[PDB]
Structures are given as structure tokens and as C-alpha cells.
């Protein structure tokens, strides 16, 4: 039904799904409605959006919110939404979401492209936001919600805890896109954290390099490659708190003591 | 000698060398003078120094320089440099080196803070300049020549050799600075290779994550941790060229052959 609104865009643009940049575009409706009422989306919301695809998301925003500024890599894309839509309140940003300079937005509404779930994710918890729905694959989902100690848990999941309060709304099949993915997605609710846990970039980079090291043998191995001696920093590393956990067993609580103990001892600035 | 006039500016102003952001400063004049005649600074060059601490590289490289850049991250270092020399041609900027936006130069002379060794070496790759020398520790330095298939070959080592000529002029002692570092250091002359191979920073990553995995191992590990599905890429990654090596046994070119395959297979855009 909106599989076949698309089938006949594609066929009307000559323009085939180029898993490229990331192109399997949501084509159930009542996905899209989930998430915009999952994000609350009223007249007073600025919204961002990554990859407006073929401009089904990105109506439904623009009917509800005040503004909505979509960011799109594709300029053949871009040139598409100009002709089929008439919006009043959307601009539409040419470029990579990851590198371009994003608006100020209060929320975030978007199908995001699965290449990207990372980077992405690591800018919007850096970004001032009440809320962000956000479609991802389910095992990476599955990721941003892992707990301390568990298999899965990464970088990612401990920026997420620290930085945010992360939730999977729902699961959603394969059927739901064009083309099909082979695995399900999941619909995420991210809101900031009130109590935010800042961590230093660097030292968690550092740390979950090899999150499956103890945490001393961890820091040793990721200044010593910055191009530092470890002469000159084995004593101090070796005081290092939360000393006999591996680095996939850390709260953002213990990271920032490893943090602050670092700052004190000169090893970060 | 040198290290006397240090001695005396340190306790004129109460400072003591803080090893937090880096303070091994360069105490040997004729260190400083073969630096400066390495790099060949004449009346035309514009110059970027990193730490210029207490200004005995920056006020050598003024005499000479058209115009010297100097990235400073403690503003106490900064009120010092302003009282203690009456530069014409020295612009101060206040930051770090790695973060804050770089001049345009064509000639870098510098005692890099061994701690950003590595970023400040990828970023200064990225630039147009005709001539670097650059101080740096030792190991780091032996990093930087290693040959494809070495033990010490790392991402570093690929990006010096597809971006640069880099050569080790020679090493210098502890002896050298003040404070003593316990590892010698080297003088590192590198200029743009002619002939550059320009390589994606995102799939290199994603290779050298883990150097010691076979290519098609380290490039299913690197793209599914992005967030996408191992389903939708074990084909394509499979015929990936050079896929008999360990990353750390690749070319420059070698990479690019990657590259440029993963780019035909939609998997990098
Ligand atoms: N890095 C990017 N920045 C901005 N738009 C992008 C980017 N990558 C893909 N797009 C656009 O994203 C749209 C599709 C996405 N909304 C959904 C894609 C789907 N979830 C996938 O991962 O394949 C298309 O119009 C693409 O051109
Ligand atoms: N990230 C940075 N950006 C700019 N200046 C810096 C940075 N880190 C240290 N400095 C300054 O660099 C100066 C020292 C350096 N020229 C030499 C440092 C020596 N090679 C070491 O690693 O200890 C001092 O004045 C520091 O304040
Ligand atoms: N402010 C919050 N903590 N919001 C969380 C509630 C959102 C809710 N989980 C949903 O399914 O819509
Ligand atoms: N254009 C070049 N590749 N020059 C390298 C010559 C520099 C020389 N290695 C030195 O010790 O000063
Ligand atoms: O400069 S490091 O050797 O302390
Ligand atoms: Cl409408
Ligand atoms: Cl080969
Ligand atoms: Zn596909
Ligand atoms: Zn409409
Ligand atoms: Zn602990
Ligand atoms: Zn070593
Ligand atoms: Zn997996
Ligand atoms: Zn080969």
C-alpha cells in the first residue's frame, strides 16, 4: 500500500534501492505513526531527521510539528522530495548526518541508516535534546541497552547509560521495510539523562579498545600506543581504581573514578 | 646552559614542569638549531610549533620565519611567552593543538607533548605542507618507518608510508630535556609523498582495530559493530582482495584495492 506508493516512485525516478548509503526505506504506516507518538511530536517541536528516503516519515513530521530540518547525503533524493512534496516547514540539509553541522532540534525522529547507528548515536548523546525515536537494527538495540557485566556490553552501551535513558518501545519484522533486511529492527526512545556521567572520550576509547582486559592492562596498553612510555606510567596506572574489574564490567560510575584518578595523577589534561 | 635559563624562569614565575599535558622541555640549543636547519626555516616560511613552552624553539624559529603559528594549551605558559619576549611575527594560540583549528603553513618545527604523538601525526598527514620536523619518542618514531609486516606496523605505520617520506634524522638522549624522560627520543623529518595514496579513514579504523586478524576477518568484525547485519555483507566481504594477508602485513596500495572494492559493493559510499 505504501510499498506500492514507493514501487511506483522508484519506477517514476528510474532510481533503485542503493544499499550504498543505506536505502531500505520503511513502508509500514502505522511504524511511522508509532513513532511519531512515540516521540510526542506537537506544533512546538523542531525535529531532525536523518535520511528522508522518499519522504514518508518525513510527511507525517511535517504535518505535526512546528519545523523539521532532514538532513539527506543523496542529492538525487533531495531533488525527488523538492518535486513530490510541498512542505511549508522543512528544510532539507544536503549532506553525511555523521559530518555535517546539525540545527538546533528539541527532538529527533528518524529511520536512521544502520551504517551510521554508531557515529550517530555517539553524536546525539553529546547533543541537548528532550527526546529521540529512532529506528536500528535489533542486535544493535540490544547493545545500547546492555548492562555492565553482560556479553554485549561496549562503548556504546556505556555512553548510552551514562549519557542517556535508552528504551526498545517495540521490535519490527523485516516485512516492514523495501527491500527486506534478514534481521528485525527495534524502535529506541532515548531521553538525556538528568544526572549526566561526562566521561573523557579518550580514556573510554582507551579502555574499550580490548573491553575484555582488566582494566590496568587496558590503560597501559592504550597510552603506551599514543606514543608515551610505560616506564613512565606503570606505578600510576597500577593504583588505578576498580583495578580487579575488566573493562566490560564498568559502570560510567567507576569510569569517571578511573577518570578523576587520572586527571589528579597528570594522565589526562 | 639553557637548562639554566629554565631553572631561572621556573622559579621566577613559581612553576614547576607538569608532566599532565607534557613538559619535557628541550634543553640542548644545538638540538633546537639542527632541528631548525632540518627544516630549512628562511624568511618565507610560515611555521607551526606545538608547545612552544618556554619559547626557546619559538624565538629561534621567529628570527628566521616570515610568520610563526604556536599552539599553546596552559595559559600560564601563554602570560609567560607575552612577558618574556617582544615577538613581531608570532601569533599564540591558545588550546590544544589537537582540537583547536591549524593556520596554514608550509613548514612545521616542533617538541611534540609525546601524548599527541599519534593524533597530531594523522591530522598533520592530512595537510598541505612541504616539511615537518618534529621531535617524538623514539619507539613512536620507529613506529612511524615500520615496513608492512613488521611487528611494529599499525595504522600509523600505513598512513605515515601512504601519505608521507618520513625519516628518522637522528635520536636524541634523555639527556636532551628537562625534566629526563627515561626513553630516548628522535628528530623526524616528513614531507608530503608525491605520489599520495589517499585511503578511507573509517575502513582503515575498522581494519587496524584488531592489525593481527586475516582482512576478512577484521573487515566482518569492524562493519556489524557499526550496527549493520553480518547476513547482508559475508558475500561481498568473502572476495575481498588481498584476503590471504593479516592487516598488518598490508601496502598503502594494498588497502586501496580494498578500498575500491568495498566502494563497487556498496559497502563504503
Ligand atoms: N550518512 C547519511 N546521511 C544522511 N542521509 C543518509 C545517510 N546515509 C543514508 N542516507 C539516506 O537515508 C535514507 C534511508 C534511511 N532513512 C533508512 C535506511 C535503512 N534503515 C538502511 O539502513 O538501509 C536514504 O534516502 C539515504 O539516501
Ligand atoms: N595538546 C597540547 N596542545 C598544545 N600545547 C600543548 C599540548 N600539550 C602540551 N602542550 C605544551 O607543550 C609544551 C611542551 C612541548 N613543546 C614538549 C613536551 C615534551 N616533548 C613532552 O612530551 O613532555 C608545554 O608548554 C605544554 O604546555
Ligand atoms: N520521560 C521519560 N522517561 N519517558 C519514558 C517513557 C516513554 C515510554 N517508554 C514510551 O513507550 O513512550
Ligand atoms: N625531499 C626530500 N625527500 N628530502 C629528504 C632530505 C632530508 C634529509 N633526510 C635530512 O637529513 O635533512
Ligand atoms: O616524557 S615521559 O618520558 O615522562
Ligand atoms: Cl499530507
Ligand atoms: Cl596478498
Ligand atoms: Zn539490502
Ligand atoms: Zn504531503
Ligand atoms: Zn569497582
Ligand atoms: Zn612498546
Ligand atoms: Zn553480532
Ligand atoms: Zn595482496
Known sequence: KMRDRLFFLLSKYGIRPRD???QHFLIIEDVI??????????????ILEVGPGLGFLTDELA???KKVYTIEIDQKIIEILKKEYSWNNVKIIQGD?????????????????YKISSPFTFKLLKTDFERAVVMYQLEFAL????????????????????LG????????????????????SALVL???RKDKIVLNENLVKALFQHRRK??????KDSIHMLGVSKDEIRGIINNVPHSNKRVFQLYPEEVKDIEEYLKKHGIIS
Open 214 to 219: 582488566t582494566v590496568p592492562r587496558a590503560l
Open 165 to 184: 535513558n535508552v528504551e526498545i518501545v517495540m521490535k519490527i519484522g523485516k516485512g516492514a521495510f523495501y527491500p527486506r533486511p534478514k534481521v528485525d
Open 20 to 22: 550504498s548509503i543505506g
Open 190 to 192: 532515548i531521553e538525556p
Open 33 to 46: 505513526e508509532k513513532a511519531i507518538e512515540t516521540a510526542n511530536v506537537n506544533e512546538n517541536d523542531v
Open 63 to 65: 504535518k505535526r510539528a
Open 97 to 113: 548526518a555523521v559530518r555535517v553541522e546539525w540545527p538546533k532540534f528539541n527532538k529527533v525522529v528518524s529511520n536512521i541508516p
Open 143 to 162: 547493545r545500547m541497552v546492555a548492562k555492565p557485566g553482560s556479553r554485549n556490553y561496549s562503548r556504546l552501551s556505556l555512553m548510552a547509560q551514562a
